[PDB]
Model the fold of this input.
Amino acid sequence: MHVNGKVALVTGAAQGIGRAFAEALLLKGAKVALVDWNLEAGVQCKAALDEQFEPQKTLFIQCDVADQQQLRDTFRKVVDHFGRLDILVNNAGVNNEKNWEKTLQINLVSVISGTYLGLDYMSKQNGGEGGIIINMSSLAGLMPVAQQPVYCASKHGIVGFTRSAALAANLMNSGVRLNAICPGPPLIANGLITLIEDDALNGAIMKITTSKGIHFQDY
Amino acid sequence: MHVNGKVALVTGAAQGIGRAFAEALLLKGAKVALVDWNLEAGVQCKAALDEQFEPQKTLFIQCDVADQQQLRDTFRKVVDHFGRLDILVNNAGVNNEKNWEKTLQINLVSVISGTYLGLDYMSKQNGGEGGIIINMSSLAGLMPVAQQPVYCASKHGIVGFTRSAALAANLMNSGVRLNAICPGFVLDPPLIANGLITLIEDDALNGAIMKITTSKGIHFQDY
Ligand SMILES: NC(=O)C1=CN([C@@H]2O[C@H](COP(=O)(O)OP(=O)(O)OC[C@H]3O[C@@H](n4cnc5c(N)ncnc54)[C@H](O)[C@@H]3O)[C@@H](O)[C@H]2O)C=CC1
Ligand SMILES: NC(=O)C1=CN([C@@H]2O[C@H](COP(=O)(O)OP(=O)(O)OC[C@H]3O[C@@H](n4cnc5c(N)ncnc54)[C@H](O)[C@@H]3O)[C@@H](O)[C@H]2O)C=CC1
Done:
């Protein structure tokens, strides 16, 4: 299908794979409100994105994805300034073992908050029409990385919550879709297009690796 | 190796599976510092416990596993009383989806904090002697529960952190072992305390996930 017209919210996209994601969506005809607190990097990201895209299809917001109030405000501003929402990308994350409290409050808590907000603003039952919510993870959620325990715990929690809430939505008949991405950056953003362009792929985990390009792991 | 004369600390033993754990230890002679938050369910457990075992082999300290200032003081007083520490058991848990913050703060954060405190108090690198640390998870950490996503998050996080910290301490040459056990839907509650002892028995196992199912009995996760 054509992703044109749709509205998307990608979290933490001022630099890196996050930013990459936006490009694809912007080049696919959608309109993206990048969300990240890296204002110095986010403004430059929007500037770079503009040169090949009309400036009304790129917005930016500043909110660290750790507080429910700020995340809710960001979602409200997205759906207001654009009128709706169809695509959610929860990818903001930090790699750190020392202050593992933050490592666990960022990767796992904020993904759940974002998915609940996406269900709220997209669940057929309570308005809207649905769409898709994708959470970004890594092999640490599927492999034990002895080097970084808390990282492995966060990724495992994400890859559990994704399936749980996908089953919940599928039982509630709410339109919202949930999927999880666990790769080994343009090839990474080539996964959003692969997943979003098929409504028969919900509540699953996909892997991007050098062995098989893009594929899906079967439980 | 030997279980007699050791010292163990099980969190949340005022009732249920927790209690089973404690009792089994006193069958094998290990001295135990019970910990839980429901003091009402704890004092009765203590009274029923010292009946079959000498008064001086057990103690109880009431605290929540999520308050760091309390989980440090519990370990400190336990070491002060028994003079050592060898076995740690993180069993505190709750099912709740309304205040979904607390499910994670309890099932996941408290386990990690207790494990780190135990490693500090047991690792050969800092004047300890060694022992074992054990964490309680469930099949929720290995299969999706429809209505309880935060519970799955906590269980999965515990599985990962155990399997990682075990190897982290193993390669450092610390001596301590870390493992996590998962029971079935409770299945005789004794069957879980019949498992805890097993972990303290064997010494060639580190970071093993034990699963209980009523079709084959007891097995371990495959990776
Ligand atoms: N580490 C890796 O190599 C892999 C990572 N991923 C996913 O990609 C994410 C990052 O990938 P990278 O390309 O390495 O980018 P990165 O981690 O270097 O980029 C982080 C960007 O997001 C922002 N950010 C991070 N956490 C945030 C938070 N809690 N609140 C607000 N802004 C936040 C940072 O300011 C920065 O703008 C990881 O979190 C994970 O989701 C996926 C597979 C492998
Ligand atoms: N609930 C069940 O029947 C089953 C439990 N499990 C696993 O076994 C663990 C123990 O469950 P049960 O013994 O059946 O529970 P229970 O319903 O018999 O009692 C819960 C125990 O946890 C303690 N506890 C709860 N939150 C605590 C906290 N924040 N700090 C300290 N202690 C706390 C309570 O004091 C009580 O001792 C569960 O956490 C779960 O990991 C798995 C399968 C079935």
About this structure: The interface with chain B takes residues 100-101, 104, 108-109, 112, 140-141, 144-150, 152-161, 163-165, 167-168, 171 of chain A (CB under 8 Å). Residues B 11-12, 14-18, 36-38, 64-66, 91-94, 106, 136-138, 183, 185-186 surround NAI (ligand 2) (CB under 6 Å).
